[PDB]
Design a protein around this ligand. Structure first.
Ligand SMILES: [Cl-]
Length: 162
């Protein structure tokens, strides 16, 4: 298992533009197009993303290409954050995948809301950090997914995924 397989499981694969749990236009493997409530805006974003005129439908290879870009983007962002970088560098590979999962799904800003949790892990306060992470909008909105990610971060294993 790896970050790719992990997110593929959590994010699923859609080849046509759809509105997510929050109502925002998305496509492929969890690729947020826009927060605009306007579908054509969303189509415009999609064409820009893929580099051709698509009318809301892409191929799986296109989808995977956007996903790799998105995964890269996520790590790049953790590594560029002054506070996250050392946190990530200090983690083992499974736990680093957990963090990548979180970044990818919610973005930098929201991710910063979890700093207390992260310090708690730095300090080997693993269960405490886990219970703490469940106290959040994230968990409240997509509990099964968050539970998997939390378990992953807490244990360093891929148990929640097999
Ligand atoms: Cl893009």
């Amino acid at each position: 298992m790896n970050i790719f397989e992990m997110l593929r499981i959590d994010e699923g694969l859609r080849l046509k533009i759809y509105k997510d749990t929050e109502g925002y236009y998305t496509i492929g493997i969890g690729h947020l197009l826009t927060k605009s409530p306007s579908l054509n805006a969303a189509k415009s974003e999609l064409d820009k993303a893929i580099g051709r005129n698509t009318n809301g439908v892409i191929t799986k290879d296109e989808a995977e290409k956007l996903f790799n870009q998105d995964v890269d983007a996520a790590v790049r962002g953790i590594l560029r954050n002054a506070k996250m970088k050392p946190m990530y560098d200090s983690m083992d590979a499974v736990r680093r995948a957990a963090m990548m999962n979180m970044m990818f799904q919610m973005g930098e800003t929201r991710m910063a809301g979890f700093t207390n949790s992260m310090r708690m892990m730095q300090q080997k306060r693993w269960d405490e950090a886990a219970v703490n992470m469940a106290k959040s909008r994230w968990y409240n909105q997509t509990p099964n997914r968050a539970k998997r990610v939390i378990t992953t971060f807490r244990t360093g294993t891929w148990d929640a995924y097999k």
